[PDB]
Amino acid sequence: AAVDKAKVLEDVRSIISTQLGTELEKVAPEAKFVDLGADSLDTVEIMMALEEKFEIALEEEGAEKIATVQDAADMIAAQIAAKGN
């Protein structure tokens, strides 16, 4: 229901940073995924790492349209939002 987008965004940024090797203050809330040192067979590894960090399941169509760390954080927040129901 009521989810804190701040914490989710912080931790998504941390996970992306730790996954690619780029320092945390460089990955901006709107930085796309190819410009930060990642191809196509590496945006799926960070998807897997995100699921592993939050222990949720990502919807697949919504995962086909992820381009900014903001939309990733928003997808994850929407997943955690609808958990009990």
Partner 1 sequence: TDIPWAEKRWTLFSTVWYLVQQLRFVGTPPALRYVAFLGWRALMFQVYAAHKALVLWQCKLDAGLARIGSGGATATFSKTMALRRLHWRNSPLAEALYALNLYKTGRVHLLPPVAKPIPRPTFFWLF
Q: How far is CA 27 from CA 18, 33, 49, 74, 84, in A?
A: 11, 9, 17, 16, 32
Instruction: State the nearest-atom distance from the C-beta of 47 to partner 1, in Å.
Output: 7
CB-wise, 10 or 59, nearer to partner 1?
A: 59
The number of angstroms, rounded, from the C-alpha of 22 to the middle of its chain's C-alpha atoms is: 15
Query: Tokens 């196509």, residue?
Result: 40
What SS3 class is residue 72?
Answer: helix
Contact residues: partner 1, CB under 8 A: 40-41, 43-45, 47-48, 57-58, 60-61, 63-64, 66
Active site residue 39: yes
Instruction: State the nearest-atom distance from the C-beta of 2 to partner 1, in Å.
Output: 26
Options 11, 35, 39, 74, the catalytic residue: 39
Active site (catalytic) residues: 39
